[PDB]
Structures are given as C-alpha cells and as structure tokens.
Design a protein around this ligand. Sequence first.
Ligand SMILES: CC[C@H]1/C=C/C=C/C[C@@H](C)[C@H](O)[C@@](C)(O)C(=O)[C@@H](C)[C@H](O)[C@@H](C)C(=O)[C@@H](C)[C@H](O)[C@@H](C)/C=C/C(=O)O[C@@H]2[C@H](C)[C@H](CC1)O[C@]1(CC[C@H](C)[C@H](C[C@@H](C)O)O1)[C@H]2C
Ligand SMILES: CC[C@H]1/C=C/C=C/C[C@@H](C)[C@H](O)[C@@](C)(O)C(=O)[C@@H](C)[C@H](O)[C@@H](C)C(=O)[C@@H](C)[C@H](O)[C@@H](C)/C=C/C(=O)O[C@@H]2[C@H](C)[C@H](CC1)O[C@]1(CC[C@H](C)[C@H](C[C@@H](C)O)O1)[C@H]2C
Ligand SMILES: CC[C@H]1/C=C/C=C/C[C@@H](C)[C@H](O)[C@@](C)(O)C(=O)[C@@H](C)[C@H](O)[C@@H](C)C(=O)[C@@H](C)[C@H](O)[C@@H](C)/C=C/C(=O)O[C@@H]2[C@H](C)[C@H](CC1)O[C@]1(CC[C@H](C)[C@H](C[C@@H](C)O)O1)[C@H]2C
Ligand SMILES: CC[C@H]1/C=C/C=C/C[C@@H](C)[C@H](O)[C@@](C)(O)C(=O)[C@@H](C)[C@H](O)[C@@H](C)C(=O)[C@@H](C)[C@H](O)[C@@H](C)/C=C/C(=O)O[C@@H]2[C@H](C)[C@H](CC1)O[C@]1(CC[C@H](C)[C@H](C[C@@H](C)O)O1)[C@H]2C
Ligand SMILES: CC[C@H]1/C=C/C=C/C[C@@H](C)[C@H](O)[C@@](C)(O)C(=O)[C@@H](C)[C@H](O)[C@@H](C)C(=O)[C@@H](C)[C@H](O)[C@@H](C)/C=C/C(=O)O[C@@H]2[C@H](C)[C@H](CC1)O[C@]1(CC[C@H](C)[C@H](C[C@@H](C)O)O1)[C@H]2C
Ligand SMILES: CC[C@H]1/C=C/C=C/C[C@@H](C)[C@H](O)[C@@](C)(O)C(=O)[C@@H](C)[C@H](O)[C@@H](C)C(=O)[C@@H](C)[C@H](O)[C@@H](C)/C=C/C(=O)O[C@@H]2[C@H](C)[C@H](CC1)O[C@]1(CC[C@H](C)[C@H](C[C@@H](C)O)O1)[C@H]2C
Lengths: 74, 74, 75, 74, 75, 75, 74, 75, 74, 74
Amino acid sequence: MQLVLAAKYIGAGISTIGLLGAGIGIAIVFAALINGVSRNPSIKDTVFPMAILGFALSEATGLFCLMVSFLLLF
Amino acid sequence: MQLVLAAKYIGAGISTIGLLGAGIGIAIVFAALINGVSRNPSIKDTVFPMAILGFALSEATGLFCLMVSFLLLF
Amino acid sequence: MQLVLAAKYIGAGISTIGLLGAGIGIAIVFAALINGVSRNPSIKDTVFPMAILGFALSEATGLFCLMVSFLLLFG
Amino acid sequence: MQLVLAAKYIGAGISTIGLLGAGIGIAIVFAALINGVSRNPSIKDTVFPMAILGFALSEATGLFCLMVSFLLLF
Amino acid sequence: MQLVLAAKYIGAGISTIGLLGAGIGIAIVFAALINGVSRNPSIKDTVFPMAILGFALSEATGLFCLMVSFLLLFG
Amino acid sequence: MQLVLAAKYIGAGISTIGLLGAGIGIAIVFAALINGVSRNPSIKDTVFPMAILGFALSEATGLFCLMVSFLLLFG
Amino acid sequence: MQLVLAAKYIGAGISTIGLLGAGIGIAIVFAALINGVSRNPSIKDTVFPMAILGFALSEATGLFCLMVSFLLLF
Amino acid sequence: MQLVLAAKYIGAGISTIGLLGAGIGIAIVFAALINGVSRNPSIKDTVFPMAILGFALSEATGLFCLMVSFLLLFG
Amino acid sequence: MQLVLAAKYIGAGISTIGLLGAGIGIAIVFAALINGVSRNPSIKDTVFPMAILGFALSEATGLFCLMVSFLLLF
Amino acid sequence: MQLVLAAKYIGAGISTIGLLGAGIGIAIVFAALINGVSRNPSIKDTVFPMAILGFALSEATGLFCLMVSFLLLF
Ligand SMILES: CC[C@H]1/C=C/C=C/C[C@@H](C)[C@H](O)[C@@](C)(O)C(=O)[C@@H](C)[C@H](O)[C@@H](C)C(=O)[C@@H](C)[C@H](O)[C@@H](C)/C=C/C(=O)O[C@@H]2[C@H](C)[C@H](CC1)O[C@]1(CC[C@H](C)[C@H](C[C@@H](C)O)O1)[C@H]2C
Ligand SMILES: CC[C@H]1/C=C/C=C/C[C@@H](C)[C@H](O)[C@@](C)(O)C(=O)[C@@H](C)[C@H](O)[C@@H](C)C(=O)[C@@H](C)[C@H](O)[C@@H](C)/C=C/C(=O)O[C@@H]2[C@H](C)[C@H](CC1)O[C@]1(CC[C@H](C)[C@H](C[C@@H](C)O)O1)[C@H]2C
Ligand SMILES: CC[C@H]1/C=C/C=C/C[C@@H](C)[C@H](O)[C@@](C)(O)C(=O)[C@@H](C)[C@H](O)[C@@H](C)C(=O)[C@@H](C)[C@H](O)[C@@H](C)/C=C/C(=O)O[C@@H]2[C@H](C)[C@H](CC1)O[C@]1(CC[C@H](C)[C@H](C[C@@H](C)O)O1)[C@H]2C
Ligand SMILES: CC[C@H]1/C=C/C=C/C[C@@H](C)[C@H](O)[C@@](C)(O)C(=O)[C@@H](C)[C@H](O)[C@@H](C)C(=O)[C@@H](C)[C@H](O)[C@@H](C)/C=C/C(=O)O[C@@H]2[C@H](C)[C@H](CC1)O[C@]1(CC[C@H](C)[C@H](C[C@@H](C)O)O1)[C@H]2C
Ligand SMILES: CC[C@H]1/C=C/C=C/C[C@@H](C)[C@H](O)[C@@](C)(O)C(=O)[C@@H](C)[C@H](O)[C@@H](C)C(=O)[C@@H](C)[C@H](O)[C@@H](C)/C=C/C(=O)O[C@@H]2[C@H](C)[C@H](CC1)O[C@]1(CC[C@H](C)[C@H](C[C@@H](C)O)O1)[C@H]2C
Ligand SMILES: CC[C@H]1/C=C/C=C/C[C@@H](C)[C@H](O)[C@@](C)(O)C(=O)[C@@H](C)[C@H](O)[C@@H](C)C(=O)[C@@H](C)[C@H](O)[C@@H](C)/C=C/C(=O)O[C@@H]2[C@H](C)[C@H](CC1)O[C@]1(CC[C@H](C)[C@H](C[C@@H](C)O)O1)[C@H]2C
C-alpha cells in the first residue's frame, strides 16, 4: 500500500512537467500578438481574439496535465 | 498486484509529458496565423481554415498521450 | 511476472514522450504553409500538398512511438 | 510511511521542472514587447498591457507546478 | 529472467524518445521547402529533391532509435 | 530515516533543473534589448526598464525552483 | 548477472536519446541549403557540398550514441 | 548512511543539468551583441555593457545549480 | 559487484545524452555558413574557416561526453 | 560501500548532460559571428574578439559540469 500511495505522489509530480508546453506556447502566442500589432496597429481588433483562442487551446494542454496530476493526488 | 498498480500510476504521469508538444505546437500555428494576418489582412479567410487544420492535427498528438494516460489509470 | 507487467506499463508511458516531436513538427509545417501563403497567396495550390506530405512524414514518427506504446500495453 | 514520505519529496522536486516553461515564456513575451516598441515606439501603450496579460498567463502555468510541489511538500 | 525482461521493456520505451528528433527535423525541412517555394516559385524543382534527401536523412536517425527499440522488444 | 533523507537530497538536485528556464529566459530578454537598441538607439531609455522587468520576472521562476531545493536540503 | 544484463538493456535504450540531436541538426542543415538556394539559385554548387559536410558531421554525433547502444546490447 | 551518501552523489550530478541554461543563455546574449554591432557598428560602446550585464544574470542561474551541486558533494 | 558494474553500464548510456548538443550545434554552425555564403558569395573564404572552428569547439563538447562514456564502459 | 560507488558512476554520467548547453551555445555564438561577418565584412575585427569571449563563457558552463563529473569518478 506504501508502494501504491508512493507511486501516486511521484506520478503526480511527473504529471506537471507537461505544463512547460503551455508556459512556452502561451508566450509564443502573445509574442506574435505583440509583434503583429507593432507592425500593423490597425490589425489589433482582428488578431486579439485570435490570440485569446490560441492561448485557450495551448492552455487546455496544461489543464489536462493538471487534471491527471490532481486525479493522482486525490 | 501492488507493484503493477504503482506502475500504472507512474506510467500515467509519464504519459502526460508528451502534451508539452501540443502546447507548444498549437502556439506555433497561432503565431503564424497572427503574423500572417498582420502582414497581409486580406489573406485571413484563406489561412484561418489552414490554422484550424494545423492546430487540430498538433493537438491530436497530445490526445494520443492522454489516451494512454487514461488507459493506465482506468 | 508482477515486475515484468509493471515494466510494460511504465515503458508504455515512456513510449508516448516522443509524440511531442510530431506535436511540434506538425505545427512547424502548418506555420510555414500559413506564412508562405500570406506572403504569396498565388502559391497556395503548390505549397498545400507539400504541407500535407510534411505533416504525414512528421506524424509517422509519432505513429511509431504509439505503436511501441500499444505493443507494450497489449501485445 | 518512510517510502510514502520519500515519494512526496522526490515528487516535490520533479514538480518544479515545469517552471522552466514560464522562465522561457515570460522572457519570450518581454522580448516581443522590446522588439515591438523598438520598431514602433508609438505602439507602447497598446502592447504593454498585452505583455502584462501574456506574462501573467505564462507564469501561472509554472505556479500550478509550484502548487503541486507545495501540496507534496506539506 | 523477470529482471532482464522488465529491463528490455523499459529500455524499449526509452528507445522511442529519440524519435522526437526526426519528428521535429522532418518538419523543419518541409517548412524550408514551403517558405523557399513561396519566396521563389521557380526554384521548386531544384529544392524539392533537397527536401526529400533532408527528410530521409533526418528520418534515418529515428529509424535507428526504433531499430534498438525492436531489438529490445523481440531480439 | 535513511530513505527520507536520501529522497530529500535527490529531490533537491532535481529541483535545480527548472533553473535552466531562467538561464535561457534572462538571455532572451537581454538579446532583445541589445537588438532593439542596435536598430533604434533612441529607444534605449524606454526599453531598458522593460528588460529589467522581464529579467526579474523570468528570474523569479528560477527562485521558486531554488526555494523548493533549499526547503528539501534543510527544512 | 541478471542485474548487470538488465543495466545493459536499460543503458542501450538511454543511449539512443542523443540521436534526437542529429535528427534536428540534419534538418537544420538542409533547411539552410533550401533557403539559401531559394534566395540565390546560382550558389547551389557552392553550398551543396557544405550541406553534405554539415549533415555528415551532425549525424556522426548520433552514430556515436548508436555505437554505445550496440556496445551495451551486444 | 550508505544510501544517503549515494543519494548525495546522484543528486550532485542531477544538479549540474541546469547549467545547460546558462550555456545556451550566455551564447544567446553574445549572439545578439555580435548581430547588433554588425548591423550598427556605432552602437558597440552602448550594447557591450548590456551584454556583460545579461551574461552575468544568466550565469548566476548556473551558479545556483553548481552551489547546490557542491553542497551535496561536500556540505 | 553486480551493482557497481550495472551502474557503469547505465552511467555510460546516460553519458551519451549530451551528444545531442553537438548534433544540434554543428548543424547551427553549418546553417549559418550556408546562409552567409548564399547572401554574400564573396565572403566564403573568410567564413569557412570560422565555421570549421565553430564545428570543432561544439564537437569537443560531444568528445568529452564520449570520453566519460568510454571511461565508464572500460 | 558498493552502493556509494554505483552512485558515483551514475552521478558522473548524469553530470555530462549539461554539456549539451555548451555544445548548442558555442554554435549559437559562431552562427552570429558568421552571419554578422557575411552581412558586414568590415566589422570582422570588432566582432571576432566578442565571439571568442562569448564562446569561452558558454564553454565554461560545460567545464563546470565536467568538473563534477571527474570529482565523482576519481
Ligand atoms: C481551456 C481553459 C482555459 C480557458 C481560457 C479562456 C479564455 C478566454 C479569455 C477571454 C479569458 O477568460 C481571459 C483572458 O479574460 C482570462 O484569462 C481572464 C479570466 C483572466 O482573469 C485574465 C484577465 C487575467 O488577468 C489573468 C492573468 C489572472 O489575473 C490570473 C490570476 C490568472 C492566471 C491563470 O492562469 O488563470 C487560469 C486561466 C484563466 C485558465 C484558462 C483556462 O483557467 C484557470 C481556471 C481553471 C483551471 C484551474 C485552469 C488550469 C490551467 C492550468 O489550464 O486555470 C485559471 C485559474
Ligand atoms: C503516419 C501517416 C499519417 C497519414 C497522413 C495522411 C495525410 C493525407 C491527408 C490528405 C489526411 O488524410 C488529412 C489531412 O485529410 C487528414 O488528416 C484527415 C484524415 C483528418 O480527418 C483531418 C482533416 C482532421 O480533421 C483531423 C484533425 C480529425 O478531426 C481528428 C479527429 C484526427 C486527428 C488525427 O491525428 O487523426 C489521425 C491522423 C489523421 C493520422 C495520420 C497518419 O492517422 C490516424 C489513423 C491511423 C493511426 C491510428 C494514426 C496514429 C497516429 C499517432 O499517427 O492516426 C488518425 C487517427
Ligand atoms: C532513410 C530511410 C527512409 C527512406 C526515405 C526515402 C525517401 C525517398 C522518397 C522518394 C520517399 O520514398 C517518399 C517521399 O516517396 C515516401 O515517403 C513514400 C514512400 C511515401 O509513400 C509518401 C509519398 C507518403 O505518401 C507517406 C506520407 C505515406 O502516406 C505515409 C503512410 C508514410 C509515412 C512514413 O513515415 O512511412 C515510412 C517512411 C517512408 C520511412 C522512410 C525511410 O520508411 C518506412 C518503411 C521502411 C521502414 C520500416 C521505415 C522505418 C522508419 C522508422 O525509419 O519506415 C515507412 C513506414
Ligand atoms: C524577482 C527577484 C529578483 C529581483 C530582481 C530585481 C531587479 C531589479 C534590478 C534593478 C536589479 O536589482 C539589478 C539589475 O540592479 C541587479 O540585478 C543588481 C542587484 C545586481 O547587482 C546587478 C547590477 C549585477 O551587477 C549583477 C549582474 C551582479 O554582479 C551578480 C553578482 C549577481 C547576479 C545575480 O543573479 O544576483 C541575484 C539576482 C539579482 C536576484 C534577482 C531577484 O536576486 C538575488 C538576491 C536575492 C535572492 C537570494 C535571489 C534568489 C534568486 C535565485 O532568484 O538572488 C541575487 C543573488
Ligand atoms: C554570477 C555572477 C558572474 C559574474 C559576472 C561578472 C561580469 C562582469 C564582467 C566584466 C566579467 O568579470 C568578465 C567578462 O570580465 C569576466 O567574466 C572575466 C572575469 C573572465 O576572466 C573572462 C574575460 C574570461 O576570459 C573567461 C572566459 C576565462 O578565460 C575563463 C577561465 C573563465 C570562465 C568562467 O566562466 O569563469 C567564471 C565566471 C567569470 C563567473 C561569472 C559570475 O565567475 C566564476 C567565479 C565565481 C564562481 C565560482 C562562478 C561560478 C559560475 C558557475 O557562475 O564562476 C568564474 C570561475
Ligand atoms: C575537437 C576535436 C574535433 C576536431 C575537429 C577538427 C576540425 C578540423 C577540420 C579541418 C576537420 O579535420 C575536417 C572538416 O577536415 C574533418 O572533420 C575531416 C577529418 C573529416 O574527414 C570530414 C572531411 C568528413 O568527411 C567527415 C564528415 C567524415 O567523412 C566522417 C566519417 C566523420 C565524421 C566524424 O564525426 O568524425 C569525427 C570528427 C572528425 C571528430 C572531430 C573532432 O573527430 C573524430 C575522431 C576522434 C574522436 C573519436 C571524435 C569523437 C567526437 C564525438 O568528438 O571523432 C572523428 C571520428
């Protein structure tokens, strides 16, 4: 039983690694938003909702990691 | 039978690591969409379907990881 | 057999790591398709099949990872 | 109990790996802010709040890692 | 015997990690093909075979990983 | 007690890995500062404080890793 | 002996990780060949032998990994 | 104590991984310095101290990794 | 003794991972050579020796990994 | 005393992983040197000392890794 609980806790720690992908990806999206608005200010209203969508989709990958992490923890 | 269960939980945590690829890749597609539209607003209708296709394909790699994750958990 | 079964399950999880390569790669190809068409709209019908081919070959690397994963889980 | 507690501490350490994602992402956002402002100084007031949003969302992914680390530690 | 078998299966899973290199690399090549053709459509016939060569050579590194994987799983 | 202590020390080492993020990120910020100033020297006073902010925020992620490291080593 | 043989097989697997470096590097070289030829077709005969040298040297790093893998396997 | 000492030595090795961050980061900063001066020779005396500062802050992340490494080895 | 020999073999496998850095770095150098000659053909004789030096320095990092790997193996 | 020795050898192999950073970073410096010189041949004498400095500093990070490596081995 020591073994099973110990595996849940190590597994939960490992499950957070994938969050680095959303950390990096969210940033890549906002970088593009910023570069895009700087080069073409008039395009802001068009690309801002695209950036919000990109963020949410990238972020969803982190949510799934965290879901597995919490499932293992609790 | 404790050792096998422990392995399933460790394996499940490890199985989420690959989701970082979708996290980054989704972002890469949206970055291109945003920069492409900022440089050429008129191309938006053409490249948006391409972005949907590209992110859906990149995302699916992470769903495959999660499939293995949930197999090992349940 | 408890130890061997355990090893199959950990190995199965480890075998999914390589899928991050196709995750990034597929995105890289579609990013180029998008930036290529934005800079040159008239090239679309030429570069679109190239992106499909590129996607498929990158995807195949993930297919090989998942195959090993499923062989360890079931085979 | 020793084995479970050992697993908690190993897992706590592993749970900080994903913070490298926010480390890189935060910088990616600020690099774009700097480059965008250098190319187009007049756009600063527009992009600065986007950079703040971008960095906060990237950072939060690493804070979710840290949160799991602390749950395991304490 | 249990320990050796378990090691083979763990190793087999580990062996697929390097496949991420080909996954990313194949895509890098096709990205260049697409951007190169978009910038200069007339160069297509020259650069397409360079992309096939590049993809094949990148792919081979993944094949080497998969080979070791299969040697462990079966051999 | 031997097992818990060993786990603390292994964990402490693992906890420093994330520091690579700040190592790369701090540099990414200063690279942008340098390229931004080279392209537009007059923007220096505007972008320098953005680089300090960016570096500090990136650095903090590494500080969080080191904090966990020290909690394991001592606390 | 079982433990030593186990270690050989685990080590053989680990020894292939470094091949991802040649996988990416080989592609980096060919991407530059393609982009350089697209921008300046007349330079092809000059850069092609540089790309062959570049790819062979990158690949060899992965072959040294594979060599260690086989030494452990056999 | 054999297990704890073993853990100190493995932890010490693990604690050097994060140095790859400073390895890449330091290079990123100097790369920008070089590309910045090539594009604008007259900016050299302005961007050179910025590169030194950038190097130092990136380097510090590696210093923290090595400190933990040496604490595990000796402290 | 099983333990020590087993540690030598796993350690030798792990020691090859760092070779990925030279795999990637050698490629980055040759990419720059290629892009540089394509943009400015007359600069070839100046930058080719720089590329050879860059290659050798990056390559030396892989040599050191392999040295540790062979020390562990033999 | 077998377990401690085993750990030293494992630790030594792990200690070379960080050398990949120098491998990539050395290359990054030389890439910049090559591209900088191709775009502006006249700047060569100015940027070459900067490249020497940058690669020497990046390389040293890998030497620090190797220091730990050789401590654990000898
Ligand atoms: C696919 C799901 C994602 C949804 C995205 C929706 C985007 C639409 C868009 C309009 C947003 O709502 C937004 C930009 O307005 C927005 O994010 C706001 C809600 C948000 O308040 C924003 C303005 C901020 O200021 C934000 C930086 C907050 O100050 C900061 C405290 C929150 C950071 C953060 O990561 O929160 C997350 C995030 C919203 C994520 C986003 C989740 O949600 C939270 C709560 C739910 C779980 C716990 C997730 C886990 C995470 C790892 O995915 O974290 C939630 C806790
Ligand atoms: C390695 C060869 C690849 C083949 C590529 C072929 C390219 C040609 C091109 C014209 C395609 O057919 C395509 C662009 O039309 C295409 O991908 C469609 C079939 C696809 O429906 C696409 C348009 C989508 O809408 C797609 C995002 C779906 O909505 C989504 C549910 C599927 C995602 C996905 O990754 O599916 C995979 C993929 C096609 C992969 C692609 C495999 O195939 C599936 C089925 C077979 C096995 C199970 C693989 C495993 C995977 C890990 O490689 O997954 C298959 C399950
Ligand atoms: C260095 C060896 C590589 C050779 C490359 C040769 C390139 C030349 C070029 C002319 C090709 O043949 C090609 C572009 O025409 C080509 O790939 C075709 C064969 C292929 O049908 C292509 C046009 C596709 O349509 C392709 C996207 C398929 O639809 C898709 C199902 C296959 C993906 C794939 O990765 O296949 C691999 C690949 C060819 C790999 C590539 C092998 O081969 C397969 C079959 C042989 C073995 C089993 C390999 C092992 C793999 C892990 O390396 O997998 C084989 C399973
Ligand atoms: C979010 C917190 C970070 C705060 C950043 C604040 C930035 C504002 C800005 C004005 C700075 O203060 C600065 C640019 O002036 C600055 O860094 C100076 C303090 C500093 O002296 C700078 C000018 C240097 O010359 C610097 C390159 C030093 O020569 C060098 C020995 C220090 C490197 C270093 O990383 O120090 C860290 C750093 C400041 C970090 C950064 C901490 O702080 C130190 C001391 C406090 C604790 C121990 C942290 C822990 C670390 C792991 O995060 O390490 C501290 C040990
Ligand atoms: C985190 C704060 C950093 C301080 C940066 C200060 C920057 C100011 C700037 C003007 C410097 O002093 C410098 C550019 O002149 C400089 O680095 C020189 C001192 C240095 O001699 C440089 C010109 C070299 O020639 C250098 C490549 C040497 O030939 C080489 C033997 C040393 C490499 C090296 O990484 O040394 C480190 C470094 C300076 C680092 C730098 C530490 O310091 C040393 C001594 C202290 C400890 C042991 C650190 C550990 C390391 C892991 O951070 O290693 C120190 C051992
Ligand atoms: C810091 C040491 C490095 C020295 C670089 C010297 C560069 C100068 C430059 C003029 C070279 O000599 C060169 C470009 O002419 C050159 O590399 C030639 C010798 C080489 O024959 C080249 C023309 C090739 O065609 C080359 C692609 C070969 O065909 C190919 C079979 C060899 C690949 C390879 O990686 O070999 C290595 C490499 C030279 C490396 C390079 C080592 O050396 C070998 C033999 C020694 C050990 C075993 C190393 C291990 C490696 C992991 O560092 O591998 C050696 C086995």
